[PDB]
Amino acid sequence: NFLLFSSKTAVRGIPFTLSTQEDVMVPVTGSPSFFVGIDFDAQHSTVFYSDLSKDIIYKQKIDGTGKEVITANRLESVECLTFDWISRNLYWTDGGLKSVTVLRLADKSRRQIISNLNNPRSIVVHPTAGYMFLSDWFRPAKIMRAWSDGSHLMPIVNTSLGWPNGLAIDWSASRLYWVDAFFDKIEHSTLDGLDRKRLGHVDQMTHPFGLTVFKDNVFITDWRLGAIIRVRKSDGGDMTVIRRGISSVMHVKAYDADLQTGSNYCSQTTHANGDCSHFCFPVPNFQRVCGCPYGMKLQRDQMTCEGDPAREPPTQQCGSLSFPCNNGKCVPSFFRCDGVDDCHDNSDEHQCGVFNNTCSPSAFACVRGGQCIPGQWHCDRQNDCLDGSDEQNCPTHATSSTCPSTSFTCDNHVCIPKDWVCD
């Protein structure tokens, strides 16, 4: 077990004890990055996350050796990930599409179970209990629960609530904790929304976002502090800061190999995933129900699936004005062959300036073809193109120009404030 948390910068794993502050897992980082959803799979020791700058959901091992994409198609803003460790279904809320999507890992079946929401932020799934929990922070804010299927969607806490930014489940006692960022409070209740109690006032917590519950403690992430803080799950009490001065601080999640155990009818050893082809979902009173991907309907057997192009006709990777990448991304057509890797797998920059896959206006053309570089790298004093045709034949920028009298002319013919001489 260790405390897993995200950021603008990177996703990090730190020990629960403050005695040692050395990262337990190698940080996950990219140069264009903004990491907002996170969840873990202790069986294969992998961590799922979403990069809101690339709109791609990845999975990466703890030691960082193996990184792959889960999906990169039709994502707008994946606010929160959650993983059903028994049935191996990955759920996520989409703030842009205003919907929540379930994806199976064994085969890439995908289904948009819940739609037509307003501001879905946080999602938590309870495999053994069978419920999924969701928060919407629109004006009539509510916390909703439903079966893992996505049916029976009914409100659970819809009064005295505003901006419920985060949800967490106390696995030890089967209680649902959530944070309110408007009233600046932590509340908890049973899975039925009854016996609602409010924790004691926390000292400086004033814009909480993510929380998680581990042993006797709640770990809250606060945006305004830029910090992760810890309190007792009973009444709050002895607030302790775990890290200080994050860039932007997003979710926390308690990695734990102990809680990712147990089984139900979806993980029986005697037969495959509860005999349901494609998706099987846990249901309360320890039942299971089968599902089928988009474009496919469940048959009379209530377990096998067949194609239904009448209600759910097939769709292409994306609309007309765009190029489909290999990883499933889609990019505007006028960003193909610009020398910039926009697909994040170099699909849009493959085989440019040959067989009439022409370069875009954003590139400069190599003389003999077979490559393009950004127009910003033409005459940039670097030899980017193999034949040197980007730096050959480059005229100077020794123009008829002057520098403002308030300013000093560098010998490189750039102007600076006259006060920056001899500093």
């Binding site: 009818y265 029986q268 050893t269 005697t270 037969h271 509860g274 005999d275 249901v283 039942q287 299971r288 129900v289 089968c290 469940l298 009379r300 057997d301 209530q302 377990m303």
Partner: protein
């Protein structure tokens, strides 16, 4: 009336039943899930006819058999053939086990050694392969030998509608088909231990038999026969049984009224408490004479010729010489026989929840006015203390002859608001 989604014509007895139930042709409403499951939950199998099952689908949470019958999901791969066509057990990767706890029962069960060929089938193979693997055996009586397999089931299951002995003796024409019982006796729901004809409709079902007392005889058409003696309207009694003190007549009033046992007499190894009344005792065995605890009304059993000496300060000393524990002083019981443990005592008053009788005996207030003399003197059973005066209703409020107060205007309002045309 068109019951069950206007598909079943059922007798219009007015017993309309819930949407959470499936109406049978017999009027019995099982819950709605108990159709098309190849259990005959009506008995008659109306619930299991092709008329319904050819135009039905299972609830999403059930498993569906190859024949289209539904079955609760937990019955999948459970070593039981619940579908009939065994699809619930098809393609299950059952556990391997070793000879110390398995003989390879066809269903894949692992059953302990000495439980194979033990005289009784336990692995529930359809061919009874648990037991018939041993040729030479034939067993003791009562545990009856059902034909060519060595199995031996008590005669409590034979000619009964269950082929549970596996081999056909349990139902087939060596008995059963020509008669249930010889003319001296009559059937039971599972015992071939048939009941003599005068046993049924005597007061108790003499075996499992929902007709013995309910409908095999006229309730009130004729009495107990003069061969035996009436003692309650539900029970007649043979002879000696009226005198022994046993609860045989079923109101227990045998040893009373005026017919029998004002007195008793003791045989060998028994002694009579001569100084006693019917409420206490009048014969005890030698197993209790001069033992550690008083038995008779006056505890004469412990005096006899014994007249022992040893008694210390650890026990209260009586006048007659016998001793008892200190707790048995000043109480409701005659512990010492001599009443020395009670003479001179000063009883503290009863608790709040304790009614007090005129003689000083405390009884629970619950016991008051229950038509039982709980303290002897009848303080708790008297006319005016146990009185509920009828409501006055002095004007308006014209009560009807059934004995409840109703408004004056309701009388001859052409509405039968009282018991039987009282208004």
């Amino acid at each position: 009336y068109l019951a069950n989604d206007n598909k079943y014509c059922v007798v219009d007895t007015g017993t309309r039943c819930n949407q959470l139930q499936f109406t049978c042709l017999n009027g019995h409403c099982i819950n709605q899930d108990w159709k098309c499951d190849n259990d005959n939950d009506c008995g008659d199998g109306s619930d299991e006819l092709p008329t319904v099952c050819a135009f039905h689908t299972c609830r999403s949470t059930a498993f569906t058999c190859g024949n289209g019958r539904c079955v609760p999901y937990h019955y999948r791969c459970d070593y039981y053939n619940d579908c009939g066509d065994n699809s619930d057990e098809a393609g299950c990767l059952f556990r391997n086990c070793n000879s110390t706890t398995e003989f390879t029962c066809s269903n894949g069960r692992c059953i302990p050694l000495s439980y194979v060929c033990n005289g009784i089938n336990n692995c529930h193979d359809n061919d009874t392969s648990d037991e018939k693997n041993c040729p030479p055996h034939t067993c003791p009586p009562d545990f009856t030998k059902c034909q060519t397999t060595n199995i031996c089931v008590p005669r409590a299951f034979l000619c009964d509608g269950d082929n549970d002995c596996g081999d056909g003796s349990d139902e087939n024409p060596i008995y059963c088909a020509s008669h249930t019982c010889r003319s001296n006796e009559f059937q039971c729901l599972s015992p071939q231990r048939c009941i003599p004809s005068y046993w049924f409709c005597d007061g108790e079902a003499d075996c499992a038999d929902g007709s013995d007392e309910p409908d095999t005889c006229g309730h009130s058409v004729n009495t107990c026969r003069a061969s035996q003696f009436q003692c309650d309207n539900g029970r007649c009694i043979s002879g000696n049984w009226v005198c022994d003190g046993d609860n045989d007549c079923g109101d227990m009033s045998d040893e009373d009224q005026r017919h029998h046992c004002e007195l008793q007499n003791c045989s060998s190894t028994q002694f009579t408490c001569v100084n006693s009344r019917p409420p206490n005792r009048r014969c005890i065995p030698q197993y209790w004479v001069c033992d550690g605890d008083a038995d008779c009304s006056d505890a004469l059993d412990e005096l006899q010729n014994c007249t022992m000496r040893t008694c210390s300060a650890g026990e209260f000393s009586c006048a007659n010489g016998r001793c008892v524990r200190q707790s048995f002083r000043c109480d409701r019981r005659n512990d010492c026989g001599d009443y020395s443990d009670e003479r001179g005592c000063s009883y503290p008053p009863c608790h709040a929840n304790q009614f007090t009788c005129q003689n000083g005996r405390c009884i629970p207030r619950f016991f008051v006015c229950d038509e039982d003399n709980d303290c002897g003197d009848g303080s708790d059973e008297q006319e005016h203390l146990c009185h509920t005066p009828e409501p006055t209703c002095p004007l308006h409020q014209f009560r009807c002859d059934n004995g409840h107060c109703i408004e004056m205007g309701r009388v001859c309002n052409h509405v039968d608001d009282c018991s039987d045309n009282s208004d």
